[PDB]
Amino acid sequence: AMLTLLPAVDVADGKAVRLLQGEAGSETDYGSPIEAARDWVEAGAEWIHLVDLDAAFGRGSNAPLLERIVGEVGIKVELSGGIRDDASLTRALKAGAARVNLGTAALEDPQWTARVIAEHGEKIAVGLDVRGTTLAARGGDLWQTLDRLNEAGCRRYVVTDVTKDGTLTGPNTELLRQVAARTSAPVVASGGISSLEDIAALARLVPQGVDSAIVGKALYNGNFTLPQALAVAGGAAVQDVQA
């Protein structure tokens, strides 16, 4: 199957925002999150990657708003931010999320994380937020953590190069290849996409196990439309898709 795009909707203070290099305080406001989500559905998305940034930073929450989005869209939603314990996981699943992402919990509560993975299977992914080879917590050695999560049976990873996130500098394809080689679980690419050629380059990683990509800033910045990105992810030529 082609590279799956997950257009992002990140929520802070009730707004759809993008951060630069994952830094709290660096938000650019792009308006209503439910409007953004509706736009992605109307563009032909199969998935949305929906993040509660306030919860991710351990500094408040937008949970009802995210629940409304998950319930209203008829497509699959990957939900992230603040999923750290049974109450929050239960809530995310009850909301109708197709997948959740664990982040800080995978580092701080390895026992709980392994239990969750064993119980919920393909509904669970782990987000690995990488700076060099060190994990960041919105956190340990990347490779040791990855081996532990593989042993626990993790079914999917979301790999973000935090240094590239929001920067429009291109994805860290080397890191993606390195992580994909280290696991039999599929990898979702995140951070740095800037161009239709970046999407084409990621689409050539699907055979290595990078089967998906989250797209944030490039869409909100108007670099390309979501239909353009989907076209390239599904094999259209960049030179044709370019406006």
Residue numbers in the entry: 0 to 137, 143 to 247
Give me lines lifted from the publication on this model:
The PriA enzyme is capable of operating in the L-histidine biosynthesis pathway as HisA, while also functioning in the L-tryptophan biosynthesis pathway as TrpF. The product of the priA gene, which is a hisA homolog, catalyzes two analogous isomerizations of structurally similar substrates: (i) the conversion of N-(5'-phosphoribosyl)-anthranilate (PRA) into 1-(O-carboxyphenylamino)-1'-deoxyribulose-5'-phosphate (CdRP) (TrpF or PRA isomerase activity); and (ii) the conversion of N-[(5-phosphoribosyl) formimino]-5-aminoimidazole-4-carboxamide ribonucleotide (ProFAR) into N-[(5-phosphoribulosyl)formimino]-5-aminoimidazole-4-carboxamide ribonucleotide (PRFAR) (HisA or ProFAR isomerase activity). Moreover, evolution of PriA in response to genome dynamics has lead to the appearance of the SubHisA and PriB subfamilies, which have been shown to have different substrate specificities. After the loss of constrictions imposed by the retention of biosynthetic pathways, we found that evolutionary patterns correlate with the sub-functionalization, yet not necessarily specialization, of PriA into two new subfamilies, which we named SubHisA2 and SubTrpF.
To potentially identify mutations in active-site residues that may affect kcat and KM parameters, we attempted to elucidate the structure of the five PriA homologs that we were able to in vitro characterize. However, we were only able to crystallize and solve the structure of PriA_Org15 (H1) at atomic resolution of 1.05 Å (PDB: 4 × 2R, Figure 7; Figure 7—source data 1). First, enzymes from Org15, Org21, and Org22 (H1) showed dual-substrate specificity but also poor catalytic efficiencies, namely, kcat/KMProFAR from 0.01 to 0.1 μM−1s−1 and kcat/KMPRA around 0.01 μM−1s−1. In the case of the H1 enzymes, the poor turnovers are compensated for by relatively high substrate affinities (KM), mainly for ProFAR. Since the loop contributing Trp139 and Arg137 is mostly disordered, and Arg137 itself does not adopt substrate binding-relevant position in the structure from A. urogenitalis, only the equivalent elements from the M. tuberculosis homolog are shown. In PriA, Gly126 faces the active site near the catalytic residue Asp128. Trp139 is important for the correct positioning of the catalytic residues present in loop 5, and for substrate binding through stacking interactions. Indeed, the indole group of Trp139 in PriAs can form a hydrogen bond with Asp128, stabilizing the knot-like conformation observed during ProFAR binding. Arg83 interacts with the second phosphate group of ProFAR, allowing its correct position in the substrate-binding pocket of PriA. An extra factor potentially hampering sequence and structural analysis is the higher-than-normal mutation rates of these protein sub-families, which translates into lack of sequence conservation and disordered regions in X-ray crystal structures.
